[PDB]
Design a binder for this molecule. Structure first.
Ligand SMILES: [Mg+2]
Ligand SMILES: [Mg+2]
Ligand SMILES: [Mg+2]
Lengths: 1088, 266
DNA sequence: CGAATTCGAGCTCGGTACCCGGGGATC
DNA sequence: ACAGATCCCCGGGTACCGAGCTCGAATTCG
């Protein structure tokens, strides 16, 4: 039998049969509602076509692809199966801490048994051999280690003296035990701290820990006075940075490393990971061989959940903990990730399932494998089959839509709570592995809900499409429509147990919606190929894919900085006591001044506005002036032996007068770290000019996604409580940034503000002179832009010469890495507010930059209408002329004199938008506002919030409770007497917060919407953008924009019934047009 | 230029300034209905109808053509087309030019103000001049007919009657002219009586013989009539028709009036 | 004797300033 | 057990003072 025992169900005879008692029509209508419960003494069972095969019998051959070599020990591989592998691809590195007494029947070589001998850390590399075999190479002898000043360990304590001390200093409140001399090594090595240029090399003790206890010593236990220097570095990072060139997602090779030592396949019965061929190499039997650029047939699985809810209410969103709310069926598509192919389209069902012949024919007409439908009578015996598939088939990558929040936590909550089956073994290693979903929703500080599974890369697509597209509501139906130009047909949950209570001919319709959903997921994954784009950064950083998906951006930057640090004789200090010890001195904290926003000369600007943009400004200030920690001398003693201007820079940043050393006496680490990343954004910007206009947009978002990780370099510096905060360098970065903009403006104004000075500097402007008078006047800046309104010049070649101005200002003012570029030229820019502007690029596309039309909250109906008003201002001609004519007179002076007869087209879309809002034949789904939950809803200081109100209405009526960061939809329902007893029962010009209502509840119950709210909000949006024409006061525009809308008056009807009954005349619309005048003539004689 | 030009020249303008003055900040949410015959001003005051005719002779000249327009007085939702006549705003006024230049549906009306400067001079303040627009479709229910007993109930006693009315809905007051002109406002709390004619209780009217008894169920009558601060000078009574209407008119330079609905009797 | 002004106490609601929180722009 | 930054505009919900409102409990005044 095995030595490391397997912790995944290989056999069973007893489970918790739970099977909604609707599958058995041998009971009358009284035992239909409900679910069964109670143990069984049968071994679980799957029917696929009318065959019975107990779910855990590997053998004759299953309804699923078996991709494993082992099952409960018994080697299920053809005899003689001894593949040789020497070029394997690794995707996920694991660390596991095995033991010498735990593996004695393993029959290893002595080298290996020596590596772990008390204990040790074994880095399992984990991947595919190109032919197809799943290889798991176990690399021994990698020790994590943290350094500590020799002096501070030579006062607090007072080599082997150190380790003998530290070994039993750990002892108290034992979790470690038996910790001996052979568990730590000290060695004195000589290295400098990273911070400040004044800091001399010193003598440190390099403490080599044996396994995964540094975190205890680096926890406050050991000696808080002693500053442990690098204690967060993992075994994996200590494996990736000190063997040169190794990368954690890339092809390897298996070489006879040293002594001509040789890697050692295990016996099949000592496999630590259920894979085909497993090896015991050591750190340096591996090589990193390149030129092979391929992805070896990793099998991506793409799965979905559909779940039923029972007992006493069927229109209730099911909850995992309830033994009765139970999963019904799950898709499982299995793809091939090298060819984008699909195979095996599995669907797992709870009881009899058919599929409509439309679905089987549509699939075969799309060249997709025929679905395989497995009928499991019991729910446990389903979810065991499913996590027997993900442990036999063993998808390397997993995908879904909202798998991290609803699919996986429901499935795991159901296994671990209700059926009590270990999930630690169903990962890739068959025992003592990790299978965990961390929800953000634990009143916490993180932004990610992470799932970590042992050797599977759970790429959710909710993340990825919420980072690639700016879309109001990210539900699969809307994202399929928007992203794929597709028309999906949804199945709201509420009608699931009406299609389930019928016979199989409607469980088939449920299987149709499951498979057709998860094929759509598959289509988005292959559209965006997240695995390759996260792969690139896993290679570039040294972090795994599983840590480049779910662990933010300080880690990739810290790890690159760590590879630069420990090749230059540097050591990266570790500050701990982070924020729940906070900053030690014994509304939103802005740790430094950040940026400049020059004052916008607000207005419509018909003249060419030529913008100049610094090219990734911050990363070229961390290079032009070599700003890193390591050159930060912030006193004036240690920079005394070098002269002003040629070897250092002085900058008052907060008042500090930091001195930053020049490049040729010390060279940064942020400058050098950035050089590698920049060329990566330069290749992804290279590919843009030669791609499809839809495959260009994905290489546009891959370059924005690396613009964020390069500028994260600046960010990471300037964080507080981070992994290596230095707000001195971040403050400087922003200082030099603000200065560089004001320098550029005092150069563009002083130098080029008489046209004859243009003609002497760019003589190509002799023909560019448009007839008007000349003025180059910067009207707006931002952290790098400067909008240079060039008046009296034609827009035709203004970008042609503007490449020259951006190459003149750059050379004449800034250091060579800094590059000012003339990225665009607007004509008809509208500068509404500080970070808000709409302008139409020269001859073409419109750039809308944050005007309540480029943001995810505002209702679709109001976005269509202000999106038509902007077109009626820029593209139209009489309206553009008229808008420009509304600069002749100050704002006040348009409240008396009428609007100059060009804007009658502008007003038409407002009176027409007002006509459409009132129609009783509105579609609620067009009026749906939506806003992000963004926090646990009990961490909110302000609790009277629209979306919050709708989150408690949702959670109260047993409905789907949107997990944190889900956009809550909400439509504002009319103020009526039912929206006023419900508040009072839950507790009078009601707030907009307490008229919020979920549109599912606003269609099933035919509630009216506010036609005051939504129209006041439409004029609110319209007003915020169009103030910019009128003076930039919103009160004048609000009074002029709504003058367009017809106003109408009627007596409140019943009062009119009474008045009429009193024998008055109706004068106007309620009569026709010649009953108004004659009788209103009589009324005057009456009152006269 | 503007077809429909109406002007208030200084002598008439200080006539209508005093006519508008008493009604402080009432009717500044008015609905101005302008037809060939003058301009009529309407409003709900404490949920009850109130009117103010402005016939030609009031101001200097009137000229109008095309359909009667209606301007929902409150202009830009804080400023009011009739603010100019509040009798301490823009104190030393001169000619005010209302004119409307449009065509039939979409008419718009410009209120131009002129302000003295003491030589005989005056500055048009094109800083507060107003621009309103016609209501597109407006239905306003205007009193009509001829009352059947109009009595002139003069300045003191129109305080006596409103005080003789009560506080809230418990206590409906009852106007009841009896034979030979009693004209008593009865109610449980107190009673006020008059002589009705065709010594300062001689309430002068006409054709008073047509006896009525009527009961007023709106508790608001004192409220609004005081709010307007009328000097009194007629109660107009429309008995004929169902839910007979009690209108009340003042007899100073204004003619503001307020129709009171009544419960079925006579 | 008379009931016709007032400068006091209640009103609104404008319109300030405030926070928050959503969600953009810029690295 | 987690982890780029700041700047900035609007909108919703408070929480004031206050200037303008009539609306009275003394009134000065006829
Ligand atoms: Mg799902
Ligand atoms: Mg830039
Ligand atoms: Mg650029």
């Amino acid at each position: 039998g095995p030595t490391q025992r397997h912790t995944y169900y290989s056999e069973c005879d007893e489970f918790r049969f739970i099977a909604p008692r609707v599958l058995d029509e041998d009971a009358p209508p009284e035992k239909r509602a409900g679910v069964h419960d109670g143990h069984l003494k049968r071994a679980p069972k799957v029917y696929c076509g009318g065959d019975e095969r107990d779910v855990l019998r590997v053998g004759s051959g299953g309804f699923w692809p078996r991709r494993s070599r082992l099952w409960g020990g018994v080697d299920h591989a053809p005899a003689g199966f001894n593949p040789t592998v020497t070029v394997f691809h690794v995707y996920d590195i694991l660390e596991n801490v095995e033991h010498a007494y735990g593996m004695r029947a393993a029959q290893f070589h002595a080298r290996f048994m020596d590596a772990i001998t008390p204990t040790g850390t074994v880095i399992t590399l984990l991947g595919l051999t190109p032919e197809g075999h799943r290889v798991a190479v176990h690399v021994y002898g990698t020790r994590q280690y943290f350094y500590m000043n020799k002096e501070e360990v030579d006062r607090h304590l007072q080599d082997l003296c150190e380790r003998m001390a530290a070994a039993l200093r750990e002892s108290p409140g034992a979790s470690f035990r038996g910790i001996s001399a052979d568990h730590f090594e000290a060695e004195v090595v000589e290295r400098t701290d990273v911070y400040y240029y004044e800091t001399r090399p010193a003598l440190f003790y390099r403490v080599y820990v044996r396994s995964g206890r540094v975190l205890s010593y680096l926890c406050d236990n050991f000696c808080p006075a002693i500053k442990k220097y690098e204690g967060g570095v993992d075994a994996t990072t200590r494996f990736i940075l000190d063997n040169p060139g190794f990368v954690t997602f890339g092809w390897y090779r298996l070489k006879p490393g040293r002594n001509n030592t040789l890697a050692q396949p295990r016996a099949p019965m000592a496999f630590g990971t259920s894979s085909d061929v497993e090896f015991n190499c050591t750190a340096d039997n591996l090589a990193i061989e390149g030129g092979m650029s391929d992805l070896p047939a990793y099998k991506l699985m793409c799965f979905d959940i559909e779940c039923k809810a029972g007992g006493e209410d069927e229109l209730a969103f099911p909850v995992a903990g309830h033994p009765e709310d139970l999963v019904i069926q799950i898709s499982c598509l299995l793809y091939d990730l090298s060819t984008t192919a699909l195979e095996h389209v599995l669907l797992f069902s709870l009881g009899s399932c058919d599929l409509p012949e439309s679905h089987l024919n549509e699939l075969a007409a799309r060249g997709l494998p025929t679905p395989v439908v497995l009928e499991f009578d019991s729910e446990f015996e389903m979810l065991l089959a499913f996590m027997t598939l993900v442990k036999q088939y063993g998808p390397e990558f997993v995908t879904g839509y909202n798998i991290i929040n609803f699919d996986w936590p429901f499935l795991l909550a159901k296994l671990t709570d209700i059926y009590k089956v270990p999930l630690d073994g169903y990962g890739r290693m068959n025992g003592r592995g990790v299978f965990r979903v961390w929800d953000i929703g634990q009143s916490h500080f993180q932004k990610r809900s992470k799932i970590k599974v042992n050797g599977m890369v759970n790429i959710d697509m909710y993340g990825i499409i919420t980072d690639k597209i700016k879309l109001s509501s990210y539900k699969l139906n809307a994202v399929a429509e928007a992203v794929l130009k597709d028309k999906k047909k949804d199945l709201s949950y509420r009608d699931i147990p009406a299609y389930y209570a019928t016979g199989p001919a409607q469980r088939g319709v449920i299987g149709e919606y499951c498979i057709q959903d998860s094929l759509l997921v598959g289509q988005l994954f292959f559209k965006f190929l997240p695995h390759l784009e996260l792969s690139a950064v896993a290679r570039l950083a040294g972090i795994n894919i599983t840590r480049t998906i779910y662990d933010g951006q300080q880690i990739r930057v810290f790890t690159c900085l760590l590879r630069l640090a420990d090749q230059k004789g540097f050591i990266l200090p570790d500050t701990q006591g982070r924020f729940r010890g906070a900053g030690g001195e014994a509304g939103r904290h802005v740790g430094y001044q950040g940026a400049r926003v020059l004052d916008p000369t607000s207005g419509f600007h018909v003249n060419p506005v030529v913008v100049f943009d610094f090219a990734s400004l911050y990363p070229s200030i961390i290079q032009a002036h070599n700003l890193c920690f390591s050159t930060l001398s912030l006193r004036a003693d240690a920079v005394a032996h070098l002269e002003a201007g040629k070897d250092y820079l002085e900058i008052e940043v907060g008042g500090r007068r930091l001195f930053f050393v020049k490049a040729h006496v010390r060279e940064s680490l942020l400058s050098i770290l950035l050089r590698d990343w920049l060329a990566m954004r330069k290749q992804i910007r290279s590919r843009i000019p030669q791609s499809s206009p839809e495959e260009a947009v994905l290489l546009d978002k891959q370059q924005a996604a690396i613009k964020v990780v390069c500028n994260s370099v600046y960010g990471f510096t300037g964080v507080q409580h981070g992994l290596l905060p230095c707000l001195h360098v971040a403050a400087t970065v922003t200082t030099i940034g603000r200065e560089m903009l004001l320098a550029t403006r005092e150069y563009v104004h002083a130098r080029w503000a008489a046209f004859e000075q243009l003609l002497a500097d760019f003589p190509e402007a002799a023909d560019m002179r448009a007839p008007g008078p000349y003025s180059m006047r910067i009207i707006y800046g931002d952290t790098d832009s400067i909008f240079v309104l060039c008046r009296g010049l034609t827009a035709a070649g203004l970008t042609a010469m503007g490449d020259k101005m951006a190459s003149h200002i750059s050379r004449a003012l800034f250091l060579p890495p800094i590059k000012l570029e003339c990225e665009k030229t607007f004509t008809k820019l509208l500068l509404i507010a500080k970070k808000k502007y709409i302008g139409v690029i020269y001859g073409g596309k419109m750039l809308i930059k944050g005007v309540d039309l480029v943001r995810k909250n505002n209702c679709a109906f109001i976005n269509r209408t202000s999106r038509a008003l902007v077109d009626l201002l820029f593209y139209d001609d009489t309206v553009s002329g008229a808008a420009a004519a509304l600069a002749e007179r100050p704002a006040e002076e348009w409240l008396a004199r009428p609007l100059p007869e060009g804007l009658q087209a502008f007003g038409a879309v407002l009176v027409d938008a007002h006509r459409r809002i009132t129609d009783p034949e509105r579609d609620i789904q067009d009026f749906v506002l939506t806003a992000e939950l963004s926090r646990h809803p009990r961490a909110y200081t302000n609790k009277r919030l629209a979306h919050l109100t709708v989150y408690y209405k949702l959670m109260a009526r047993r409905a789907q409770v949107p997990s944190i960061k889900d956009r809550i939809p909400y439509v504002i329902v009319a103020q009526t007497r039912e929206v006023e007893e419900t508040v009072a029962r839950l507790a009078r010009k009601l707030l907009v917060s307490e008229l919020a209502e979920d549109p599912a509840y606003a269609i099933a119950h035919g509630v009216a919407l506010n036609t005051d709210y939504y129209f006041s909000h439409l004029l609110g949006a319209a007003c915020v953008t169009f103030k910019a024409l009128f003076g930039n006061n919103a009160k004048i525009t609000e009074s002029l924009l709504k003058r367009f809308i017809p106003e109408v008056w009627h007596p409140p009807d019943d009062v009119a019934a009474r008045l009429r009954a009193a024998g008055f005349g109706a004068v106007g619309a309620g009569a026709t047009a010649e009953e108004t005048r004659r009788m209103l003539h009589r009324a005057f004689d009456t009152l006269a | 230029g503007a077809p429909c030009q109406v002007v208030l020249q200084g002598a008439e303008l200080n006539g209508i300034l005093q006519a508008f003055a008493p009604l402080r900040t009432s009717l500044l949410d008015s609905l101005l209905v302008m037809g060939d015959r003058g301009i009529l001003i309407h409003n709900t005051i404490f949920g009850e109808q109130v009117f103010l005719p402005l016939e030609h002779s009031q101001f200097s000249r009137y000229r109008w053509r095309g359909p009667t327009a209606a301007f929902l007085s409150l202009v830009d939702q804080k400023r009011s087309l009739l603010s100019v006549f509040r009798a301490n705003q823009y104190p030393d006024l001169r000619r005010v030019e209302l004119a409307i230049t449009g065509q039939a549906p979409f008419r718009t009306l410009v209120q131009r103000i002129w302000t003295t400067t003491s030589d005989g001079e005056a500055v048009e303040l094109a800083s507060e001049t107003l621009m309103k627009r016609e209501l597109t479709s407006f239905v306003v229910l205007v009193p009509q007919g001829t009352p059947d007993v109009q009595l002139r109930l003069t300045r003191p006693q129109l305080t006596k009657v409103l005080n003789a009315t009560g506080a809230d809905s418990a206590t409906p007051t009852t106007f009841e002219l009896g034979v030979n002109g009693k004209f008593s406002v009865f109610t449980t709390s107190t009673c006020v009586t008059f002589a009705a004619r065709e010594n300062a209780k001689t309430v002068y009217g006409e054709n008073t013989h047509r006896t009525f008894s009527v009961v007023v169920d709106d508790c608001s009558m004192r409220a609004v009539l005081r709010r307007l601060q009328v000097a009194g000078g007629t109660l107009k009574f429309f008995l004929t028709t169902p839910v007979p209407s009690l209108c009340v008119t003042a007899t100073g330079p204004n003619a503001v009036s307020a129709v009171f609905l009544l419960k079925p009797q006579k």
